[PDB]
Design a protein around this ligand. Structure first.
Ligand SMILES: [Cl-]
Ligand SMILES: [Cl-]
Ligand SMILES: [Cl-]
Ligand SMILES: [Cl-]
Lengths: 401, 401
């Protein structure tokens, strides 16, 4: 008779409902990030919602405030370890244990692993369909106070339609990426469009907050080799992953994919050790001085980690590093400009005017570093939508004659 | 007959008027920073102003915009070396050459030295009264295209009156400084008041953008020894200096004082190598989320380097590091609050809400790191002036109920 691989752990295996029962009112509960959200325990949570608690997450709910905690993404794990951001309960989704009793955090390492390593109570949701992902991404099963068994497809993303605006942006981004570059970029039409114009590039590498289908396609086609990387050569390094079922199969037990916790991956000093960084991110608006506002609302994005500034700062120390803010020139169905004379009332600046590098729209490329305020205004106006250039120019004139 | 110590260089020695004559229209001219501004050449410049040119400086003229170039202070030298910020002419004030033909940049190393090492044309203003200051702060006299001799007291500062608001702030700052701390702080009533409450501290060290009379007083009294520093032990490290004639005598040929260029001193990665950093800076306003606006206008300050964020970021990586934004709770003769519901229209954020640490007023201390937006608002309100708390609270309520 074959081995019952769950046998030894039977004592701690409980239903989702039984597990979440041990959360207490007023506690902060951290969940595995993004695609690795523990679906069975979350369902049990809403079921007992009546009785209950603060959920700590980094998602844009209603895309893609009182309790929001501004923090740099790379700083979250130390803040957790120092009890500055206290987590009473970590509900993490995990892969099946290996022979040594280690489970992988699969597609969600990020702060999810640090949370599990620090929380007073740890619930591990072991999903047969959570892939086993390499890197510093394991936890021994003995650390789990409760184990909830599951079998369900993790959250996936379909790739969005690329329009001609996104195509134009992508093509401009590709222009800035030379052979051997190490990339950080996200998901959505813009980054996908950028990757589509990289098929002629050679030996690109990945050191990124996350990647998805578009990156894997360039691995399979031989463009992204990691072969010229100066840190973790030959490896795709990330802190979390999300994409199609195909991405999740490609990464499963794939030693060329390594996840590490966010305090490693997103640390500007670690990012900087990768030569030729090109970081690509989007934002909601940028003012004529170069201040960048990037928030969940308006983003049309599932993950709101605020991790982009980590990469702007890391790229700035990378040998021949570049960061790009790649955005549609307009918003709200073309009725609003993302290049604004003044940021919106009460908006939170997320990347400082003193650190912004390249800005890219469908109308072209601006490099702001080293430009005066006049020069910056003029440079951004030329890549703004034509319908907004007149009003932007008059603010320019009011300010600088 | 004794040696004419100028003799060998006679060929390049010219009047101030003759020297500046070789600047050409449309050129960018960099001047030694702050107290080391080359006074003779500047006078000659205004005299020929008729014929003439962009002066690159980091001063707040009319305290203590089109051509302003937003940049992190520590990044300026590389931007100069990469011709991203091109300097056609460097007019630097220097000490008399030593026996080896090396002049010191005296009290202005900062970007002044990097400018002199990169500019197409270099005018050295050798002042008998510019002190010889140690550190990476020399240039061989053969690099000077013209030499202008001078003998005049460099710009000095009188220490300002400390009021009870400043005293209260200083006392709160001192509370946050433990024995063995390495300090960065500026000039003005607030930092002076802070230093006045540090007389009972032991083995403090200095790694600072600049220092002045207040720091030297604590050296002379045995509090600031540098003895517990983990970088440059026993030394006061800075990038520029300004104070009374007394400070300038104390530093002259004093090997315990070392200046280095700003790309060394202000680099967050170098700052971070000093354990127990305490960085103290002021700003114009801070909003209820923690965004910090610090500009020249309203600052009542001579130097507008924007260097403070370098130290917020460096302190964040220092072992047990702290940064403090120390400000009067009010402005404009008590008619305005520096703790605001929303930053001023068009204001430039200089330190991100995600990185602010401590905020200190005459009404107390707030630590914002790890606090939610609600918690941050409440924490800042409690240290706002009582006359503004009601209106701040109603914005709090409109936002978070
Ligand atoms: Cl830590
Ligand atoms: Cl121009
Ligand atoms: Cl350099
Ligand atoms: Cl509270």
């Amino acid at each position: 008779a074959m081995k019952d691989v769950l046998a030894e752990y039977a004592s701690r295996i409980v239903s989702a409902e039984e597990a979440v029962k041990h959360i207490k009112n007023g506690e902060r509960v951290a969940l595995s990030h993004a695609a690795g959200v523990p679906q069975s325990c979350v369902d049990a949570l809403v079921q007992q919602a009546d009785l209950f608690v603060e959920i700590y997450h980094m998602l844009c709910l209603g895309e893609g405030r009182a309790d929001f905690i501004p923090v740099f993404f790379y700083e979250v794990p130390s803040m957790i370890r120092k009890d500055i951001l206290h987590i009473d309960v970590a509900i993490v989704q995990l892969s099946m244990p290996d022979e040594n009793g280690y489970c992988s955090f699969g597609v969600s390492c990020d702060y999810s692993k640090p949370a599990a390593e620090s929380a007073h109570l740890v619930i591990g949701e072991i999903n047969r369909q959570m892939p086993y992902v390499h890197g510093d991404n394991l936890i021994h099963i003995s650390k789990l106070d409760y184990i909830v068994m599951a079998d369900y497809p993790i959250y996936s993303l379909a790739k969005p339609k690329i329009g001609e605006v996104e195509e134009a942006i992508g093509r401009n981004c590709a222009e800035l990426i030379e052979d051997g570059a190490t990339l950080q970029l996200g998901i959505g039409a813009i980054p996908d469009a950028a990757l589509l114009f990289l098929k002629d590039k050679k030996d690109l590498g990945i050191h990124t907050e996350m990647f998805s289908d578009g990156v894997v396609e360039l691995v399979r086609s031989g463009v992204i080799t990691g072969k010229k990387k100066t840190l973790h050569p030959g490896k795709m390094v990330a802190t979390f992953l999300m994409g199609s079922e195909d991405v999740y199969h490609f990464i499963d037990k794939n030693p060329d994919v390594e996840l590490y916790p966010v305090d490693y991956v997103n640390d500007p000093r670690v990012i900087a050790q990768n030569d030729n960084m090109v970081s690509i991110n989007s934002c909601i608006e940028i003012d004529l001085m170069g201040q960048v506002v990037s928030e969940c609302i308006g983003s049309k994005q599932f993950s709101g980690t605020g991790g982009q500034v980590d990469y702007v700062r890391g790229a700035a120390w990378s040998k021949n590093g570049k960061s790009i803010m790649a955005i549609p020139s307009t918003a709200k169905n073309g009725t609003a400009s993302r290049i604004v004379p003044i940021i919106a009332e009460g908006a939170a600046v997320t990347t400082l005017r003193n650190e912004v590098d390249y800005v890219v729209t469908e109308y072209g490329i601006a490099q702001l570093k080293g430009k005066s305020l006049r020069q910056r205004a003029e440079a951004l106006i030329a890549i703004a939508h034509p319908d907004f250039r007149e009003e932007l120019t008059k603010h320019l004139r009011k300010r600088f004659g």
